[PDB]
Nucleic acid binder design. Structure first.
Ligand SMILES: COc1c(N2C[C@@H]3CCCN[C@@H]3C2)c(F)cc2c(=O)c(C(=O)O)cn(C3CC3)c12
Ligand SMILES: COc1c(N2C[C@@H]3CCCN[C@@H]3C2)c(F)cc2c(=O)c(C(=O)O)cn(C3CC3)c12
Ligand SMILES: [Mg+2]
Ligand SMILES: [Mg+2]
Lengths: 482, 198, 485, 194
DNA sequence: GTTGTAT
DNA sequence: GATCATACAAC
DNA sequence: GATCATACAACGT
DNA sequence: ACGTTGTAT
């Protein structure tokens, strides 16, 4: 029996609890941000790896270290989830452009899982550094962590369009998302094209961005679905395997598949094909031996009586999949089914904000340093009088005040003058300070000019994007057909 | 007063830290998210009148499940076994083991999810229990908590705050469960798009 | 097939691999080093926590972070093993003096496991700080970690006799150690005793170290086993549950178990008893309630009328773990080898290790003080001849020639001259000189003291005694385990 | 080669039906299993995981030996049969390679596996079918493993040869035997600590 | 059944 | 360590 | 997240 | 032959 009891309507608590869980799953778990293309766990892993000092230059750190730090500081969930995410960010068949570089067993294409965290080490990929470019230059807003004793980025600078490039997935509450991966160079071309001519259409965009570029490669049948997709945010495209029918030394046929579709297991396909083989559906096949090495990829042999028919069957039975575009992403807090143009515009604007913020940071730093340097230059110009003032002083306070009164200095300048090492009172030191000061002046001029002109910012974005394209982009893996 | 005498066979679930009483008008049953909170509850609960049943993971949404899947699932089976009420065509409310069933889910959003699922289960297959007013919900100020904290804050009747779950109209209720939990996705998405303040 | 095929004899590879695994388990997993009474995993959890900065003062940190760091930097094994070890050294009924403070579900005496690492956080206990005290004064050797990119302490300072006080266990290969926990104050009294009178007999030691003091308490039968154990390292003693007989409000007898023996599960005893009762292997039992509340242990076995509670009690002592045995096999690693030690040998090892620690610390402090004093002399000369100094500096292009000319002129070292060149301008005030003077004088006093301490062993011994006395003053317990004949 | 289509849970089999070239690699855990299987040449090399420390048969009852699932998996894979069925002319692999981890626990598992093989697969070891891989193990890429320890034209292997069977039986009865004292003496004698 | 973040 | 159920949405 | 089998010594039942 | 204890696979 209770002393203090209250009544609770069923529908009320149901509604409140459900809205809570749903909203929290949508805007903080299952869906990515339109700007950096990341969902909370991934962003927290990248930032966690950043602070951990596992940049591509530095050596790897064990997975348990990273998982531990990430959970303890940012991601208030289980080990298995974080580690699973990290593993997925280090597999060539999962991420078109991998964000994690790992050593040891990280699973195979054939469904095999990664090794334990106590056996695998990992660091950031070279391209993930672009996701983290100038994060330390106030390019991104921060927030207190769950424990409210650390801070984490709300978003990442993301100097390459990670959303379209790496795709997204998937299931949430009341909604789900599905975006395919794209070739880096083409996505960059699309961004630059949107920046150049704002009056562009979908077809024009498709000229430089033909369609999806899957990490597994393979083929895509049709283009109408792709157009409907990029235009409306939702669509449907068919995917097929890349194959070839060779000739044996016995003088027969040999249907060999070299590229399986996206998110497709060769082993599972093998099992299902055998299951369908012992059911009199697919006749003619003599033996189905998976002959994939660590150098590449699955041989299916047939008998006299018909290879084309048998392969057509093997495609019409399972080898052939349906990609359903449902490009849904979080934008300004609320989730939305976005077109290609909307994603592109969002990423562009985000890039403008990042570049501008960075330029402002650099500006402020440069100006402060210049101020202090003016102070120091004055000090070296009046060294004897300065040291006279300092010696005459009893406490550093009256020294500071006296310097500020005599040489017309600020608190910062006088502080810097007081915190001067004796070894910088030499002859050649003054000139070096002068040079640094002049260079600083030029720099500040340039940055102010950048902040006064949007066109320059846009150009900076285009240039740096082009440099990413040059440094990282791959040749197209997926061949499009009709 | 009548109390248990140990020795009994009982055949109650392998979990379930049952109480030392036999009075289904003074005893309580706390449904708990995982053994992480299970340990905290079990060791600091006044084991005379308070029992603890750990439900592991996200319980099955009965609205989106076959009855063949419901009667197969062992978590719901364990709950019903703990209640000793019976299933559907055997549900005797006047033969329960606890007249105070406290839902003590975790204080995160997934806890709210589990609470939701449990409420669906209770409204759809233990309806007399909610009708009789046996279903209560704990209102904390759980694995990340000590014994003393758990007790003194949430389990001690002298200083705890609990909520009695009482239905208004069965129509609006059934509709709500059919929307939030039913296989119908679109109306749920409409609900989340029309009744959520981001 | 292959090409380069060597040949291995079965017995050879067997003996080799087995010697490998055996030695690895013996010297670096199962048995603790006698000096600090720690196994590699516990030592790595403590040191890892120290480097993490989760000291008593600083707040807790998530367990997964601590275990992640311990694993990544020091302990190359399962996350589970580390977390389990930590959780264990956080439990009062497992560790006589807990080395870890925890928050959240850390397990129960009933055998319930701790919560997942994503719920529990932890830190050092106030007493573990003594296990780590003066770690940063070269009181302890270091080695490379397994990855050879970090460094770890071989042994800890251990400013309280942790081996005897907390006990040790157990299972190795070809060997197995078993040491019971002891009372802090008593073990310290024994240590000081051996320090003063070195011709002390085992009986004299037992006059202050009566015997084991288990975290749960209970009773001990047979002190002969205690003496034999303290004199040989091997011995057997009896442990009985602290119990009492009550009377119900209905008039019949009631057995009340209030303290169970070391490493004995209450729930397991309940189950065993029930299974013994519903089998008629024990008769006269009316009820078996577990009335233990979060403030005390109360295990009730209610007896029917016309039945003796004494017969039932003794039958429980005979058939259940309400009464068990303890087998002293005091085995620990000393000088890199496993040894079965007497009490006196363990105490001696601890005192020696302690002397090493204290002497090392004093040497460290002396070196540091003298260095700082040297630099201070340099700064004094500079701050006296400031004009000349500043002149020499200004008339110098390179810093190398400035340093060289400062050294040449004021007859100084390279370190002193570098310190002068590194002087902030604010250190040229009128009130700065006197401060430096005072600090210098204090440094002279300190150096004199430390030099005296290093010159006299008696002062080292005395320091050890006093600091032990302070540890005991700050952390000691009242005895829990009653020793009876 | 085989033909598939035919009817253990683990065990990634090979492809060639030839017990003269084919090789079975006993690897510990699915962590090593992943890499080993990922780079293995799926024609004459199959992998078998050994989850956990295998049972010491020199100290276990027959009732518990026959009960153990791992031993049953090794005997199922080898296709030899057990006890009064040990048909060595029905073995499925020409090379049973012990590929344990490169730590001390791996050496322990090597000892255990060698006791299992010597005691209950004696004809196999008596006919030069048992090998020991020589790594320089989940902390390794598939290409790394393939290039280092799994490639025939490279790699170093130890052929387990038995000399005096009396000495073998003696050593097995001493190290892995029921008696503890001789093990303690052996440890005290054949070990250099400091 | 499966996809991926979660309990 | 491996192996187990399941929410959630969409083929 | 909860459980599951095993080495290893020493004692117990 | 089993269980039970604590660091390990
Ligand atoms: C598969 O091995 C384990 C078992 N089993 C052994 C048996 C045979 C195979 C399948 N059935 C059981 C499960 C187990 F019960 C517990 C643990 C375990 O706790 C643990 C750890 O790191 O904490 C690690 N391992 C693996 C690293 C050895 C465990
Ligand atoms: C007991 O819940 C889990 C199950 N089960 C649910 C079933 C229902 C009752 C009987 N036990 C089974 C096993 C499971 F199969 C997997 C996971 C799991 O993978 C996981 C994780 O963090 O990766 C976390 N949990 C946490 C929720 C505890 C899991
Ligand atoms: Mg899971
Ligand atoms: Mg374990």
């Amino acid at each position: 029996q209770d002393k203090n009891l209250v009544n609770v309507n069923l529908t009320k608590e149901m509604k409140a609890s459900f809205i809570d869980y749903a909203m929290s799953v949508i805007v903080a778990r299952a869906l990515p941000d339109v700007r950096d293309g990341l969902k909370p766990v991934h962003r927290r892993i990248l930032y966690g790896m950043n602070e951990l000092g596992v940049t591509p230059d530095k050596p790897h750190k064990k997975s348990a270290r990273i998982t531990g730090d990430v959970m303890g500081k940012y991601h208030p969930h289980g080990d298995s989830s974080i580690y699973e995410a990290m593993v997925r960010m280090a597999q060539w068949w999962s991420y078109r452009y991998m964000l994690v570089d790992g050593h040891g067993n990280f699973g195979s294409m054939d469904g095999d899982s990664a090794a334990a965290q106590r056996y695998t080490e990992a660091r950031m990929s070279k391209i993930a550094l672009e996701m983290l470019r100038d994060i330390n230059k106030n390019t991104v807003d921060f927030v207190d962590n769950y424990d409210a004793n650390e801070r984490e980025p709300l978003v990442l600078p993301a100097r390459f369009p990670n959303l379209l490039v790496n795709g997204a997935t998937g299931i949430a509450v009341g909604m789900a998302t599905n975006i395919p991966p794209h070739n880096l160079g083409e996505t960059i071309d699309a961004v630059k094209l949107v920046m150049d001519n704002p009056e562009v259409t979908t077809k024009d965009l498709m000229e430089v961005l033909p369609g999806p570029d899957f990490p597994t490669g393979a083929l895509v049948m049709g283009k109408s679905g792709i157009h409907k997709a990029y235009e409306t945010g939702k669509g449907s495209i068919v995917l097929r395997s890349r194959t070839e029918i060779e000739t044996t030394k016995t003088g027969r046929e040999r249907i060999v598949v070299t590229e399986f579709p996206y998110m497709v297991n060769k082993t599972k396909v093998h099992e299902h094909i055998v299951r369908l083989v012992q059911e009199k559906r697919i006749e003619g096949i003599t033996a189905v031996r998976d002959e994939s090495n660590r150098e590449g990829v699955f041989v299916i042999e047939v008998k006299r009586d018909s290879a084309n028919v048998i392969l057509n069957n093997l495609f019409k039975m399972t080898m052939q999949t349906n990609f359903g575009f449902n490009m849904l992403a979080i934008q300004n807090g609320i989730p939305k089914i976005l077109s290609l143009r909307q994603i592109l515009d969002a990423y562009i604007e985000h890039q403008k904000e990042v570049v501008v913020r960075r330029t402002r940071f650099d500006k402020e730093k440069a100006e402060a340093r210049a101020h202090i340097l003016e102070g120091l230059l004055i000090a070296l110009d009046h060294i004897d009088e300065v040291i006279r003032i300092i010696r005459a002083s009893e406490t550093d306070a009256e020294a500071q005040a006296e310097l500020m009164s005599k040489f017309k200095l600020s608190e910062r300048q006088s502080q810097a003058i007081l915190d001067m090492r004796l070894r910088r009172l030499t002859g050649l030191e003054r000139d070096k300070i002068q040079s640094e000061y002049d260079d600083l002046l030029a720099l500040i001029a340039d940055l102010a000019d950048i902040l006064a002109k949007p066109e320059r910012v846009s150009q900076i974005i285009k240039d740096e994007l082009d440099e990413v394209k040059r440094k990282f982009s791959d040749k197209r893996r997926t061949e499009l057909m009709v | 007063k009548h109390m248990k005498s140990g020795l009994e066979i009982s055949n109650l679930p392998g979990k379930l830290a049952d109480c030392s009483s036999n009075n289904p008008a003074e005893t309580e049953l706390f449904i708990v998210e995982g053994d992480s909170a299970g340990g905290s509850a079990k060791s600091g609960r006044n084991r005379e009148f308070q029992a603890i049943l750990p439900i592991r993971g996200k319980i099955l949404n009965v609205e989106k499940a076959s009855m063949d899947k419901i009667l197969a699932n062992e978590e719901i089976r364990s709950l019903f076994t703990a209640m000793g009420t019976g299933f559907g065509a055997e549900f005797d409310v006047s033969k329960a083991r606890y007249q105070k069933l406290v839902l003590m889910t975790d204080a995160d959003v997934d806890g709210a999810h589990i609470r939701t699922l449990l409420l669906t289960l209770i409204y759809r297959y233990m309806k007399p229990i909610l009708e009789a007013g046996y279903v209560y919900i704990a209102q904390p100020p759980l694995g990340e908590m000590d014994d003393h904290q758990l007790w003194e804050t949430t389990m001690d009747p002298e200083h705890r705050l609990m909520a009695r779950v009482s239905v208004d109209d069965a129509a609006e209720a059934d509709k709500i469960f059919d929307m939030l939990m039913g296989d119908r996705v679109e109306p749920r998405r409409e609900f989340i798009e029309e009744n959520a303040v981001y």
